[model samples]
Target: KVFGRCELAAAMKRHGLDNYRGYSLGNWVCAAKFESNFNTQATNRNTDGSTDYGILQINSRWWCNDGRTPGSRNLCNIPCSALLSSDITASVNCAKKIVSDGNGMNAWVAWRNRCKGTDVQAWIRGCRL
Candidate 1:
């Protein structure tokens, strides 16, 4: 529903995602860029019979239940559809839980594949946050 980097940064900042568990907003931005291009409704199915949900591409295997994935743990305790919204509060909270549980952003393959150790300021450049 949106596309501006600054807008995304501002929303994340307001949601207290600017710095969660030492992971910076830029890191989140980079991950979102690659994972979903900031699309809240993005869904990607994995060959392992799992699906990634939302802008962060959280997996159904552990984080949410899409109703079709048997034995889904739904660790976030939220309906999978909740993650697919422009309002990302629920998703952010779930992500925080994921981070604190030990994976950090490494849980996101996009982060490891593209955002790790890279200068990510451009993701938030010109954003007045």
Candidate 2:
């Protein structure tokens, strides 16, 4: 797992996630914390038979394919495993595309439920960025 919030912040910033799509760094940090705790290999099976991948919790139904899930749109045209890597380049790029596609941070349920109207400063607290 990633060491701390600052690590997440730094990594995200290095990947060009700081203040992306008019959303704050806190929003990205908060969503990452709530979604997967910054674990790149994190996976959660959804009730709908889809799985969310990586720190961003990108779904298999539309974003990527695991070969087991039939009719996956695979809009990202990358394997779901790509999103589970520690590098995070694929996931970050995919998330940026998702946000730019008019969803914004609202694409993540964790962002909507936990970060939408809350005090998100703590997510970026103590970070140099």
Candidate 3:
């Protein structure tokens, strides 16, 4: 499902992403925007043959298993397909795991380009929980 910004914000909040690991709701919203345009079905295959799946673009090489990425660690212990669910439970949980791995939200280069250290207050201003 393609989500509008605020709708995505609401979903993320409901899943406890507001302040997961020092990352704010704004941060998540912004990263989702740049990563997958709030698209639950989004998937991008990296040059290394590892695909980034779902809205947060969780990658197969390190997080979820694509059953194809050589050396896929599946750190999140989930199938890459799970990241595409509109329900977002797996995606959000895996996202938390990514942060828990350290390096914060710097995991995504696109997110860093667009939202790094930027005040995202405006991103979630009207999407208040």
Candidate 4:
């Protein structure tokens, strides 16, 4: 029953500047919102006998690559379970590092533009900040 948005907002407010722009915090949150309605424990069976679970809609394959047993630091260091862990701030820090280093926030914006909008987009734009 973890909610991605709840933890994400706290992370954005902590690591990023208050008026940060192009960070895509809202957009990224919106993307997750669109993908799984912010459900942290969300799970979906894949065609490949694997599964997609938890908030941020992390696929089980991605989870396996982390090389940790569920709550282990190695796997918990990743976004899939990290963002749903007890310490939301730590989880967010992990996710931010990954997204920022690789895709950058604009990818989140693109995700938002493509998958986000309507009520979710409006909420991202209007509610956060």
Quick one: best lDDT, which candidate? 3
Between prediction 2 and prediction 4, which has the larger lDDT?
Answer: 2
Per-candidate TM equals 0.95, 0.93, 0.95, 0.51
Clashing pairs in 1: none
> Which 10 successive residues of model 4 have the least lDDT summed?
64-73
Question: What's the lDDT for candidate 1?
Answer: 0.86
With candidate 3 superimposed using the best TM-score fit, by how many Å does residue 62's alpha carbon deviate from the native?
1.0
Per residue, candidate 1 scores C-alpha lDDT tens digits across 1-129 of 655788888888899988899989999888888998999989999887888889888888899878878777999998888899889898888888888888788888889989998998878888888
Worst 10 residues of 1 by lDDT: 1-10
Worst 10 residues of 3 by lDDT: 120-129
**CA lDDT, candidate 1, residue 53:** 87
Better of 1 and 4 by lDDT: 1
Instruction: Name the lDDT value of residue 49 in candidate 2.
Output: 87
Candidate 4 error regions (>4 Å): 2-12, 15-22, 63-91, 104-113, 116-121, 125-128
Candidate 4 local lDDT, 1-129, one digit each (tens): 545454655554666622344444565566566555766655566666555544454444533233433433333335454544444454344445445455554334435465544443443453445
The CA lDDT at 82 in model 1 is: 89
Per-residue lDDT tens digits of candidate 2, residues 1-129?
A: 553788888888899988889888888889998999888889999887899999899999989888867677888889999999878789888899888978788889889999998988788998887
The residue ranges of model 2 lying beyond 4 angstroms of the native Cα positions read none
Residue 36 miss distance in model 4 (angstroms): 1.7
TM-score of 3: 0.95
lDDT of 2 at 92: 86
